[PDB]
Design a protein around this ligand. Structure first.
Ligand code: NA
Lengths: 13, 139
């Protein structure tokens, strides 16, 4: 499996 | 679940039938995707065709995503500051076509597919924005 994301995604629109 | 939150984010506004985060740099595979879509089944071969040196062949031959035949409408994948492609699924058996946008960051590709009637423009903005965010985060 992949490296974890750098943080949360941007706020939803 | 971590990258799945990114898929969830891409899907949250209701315009996409599926989305995916797909590694291309350190290795070529799907990191997260909507269950039951074509993106989930994207192969290393298909990723290579998306990112590869040949930027002309797929206009003649098309390409596939998860074995689903597609056409390339626009290739700006290696245009700095853009790094997107606009794609469209082929219609088989009378079915609608769907717009697909790809955004390329440094390590991953962002894929989104519209629902029926969803225009490519907003899809491109969505893939671009996510890819840009990931690029600014070192991905
Ligand atoms: Na899902």
């Amino acid at each position: 499996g992949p490296p974890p994301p750098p943080g949360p995604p941007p706020p939803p629109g | 679940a971590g990258w799945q939150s990114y898929v969830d984010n891409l899907m949250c506004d209701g315009c996409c039938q599926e989305a995916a985060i797909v590694g291309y740099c350190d290795a070529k595979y799907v990191w997260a995707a909507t269950a039951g879509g074509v993106f989930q089944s994207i192969t290393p071969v298909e990723i290579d065709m998306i990112v590869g040196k040949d930027r002309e062949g797929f206009f003649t031959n098309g390409l596939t995503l998860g074995a689903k035949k597609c056409s390339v409408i626009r290739d700006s994948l290696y245009v700095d500051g853009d790094c997107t492609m606009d794609i469209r699924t082929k219609s088989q058996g009378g079915e609608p076509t769907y717009n697909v946008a790809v955004g390329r960051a440094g390590r991953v590709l962002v894929f989104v597919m519209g629902k029926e009637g969803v225009h490519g423009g907003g899809l491109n903005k969505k893939a671009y924005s996510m890819a840009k965010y990931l690029r600014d985060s070192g991905f």
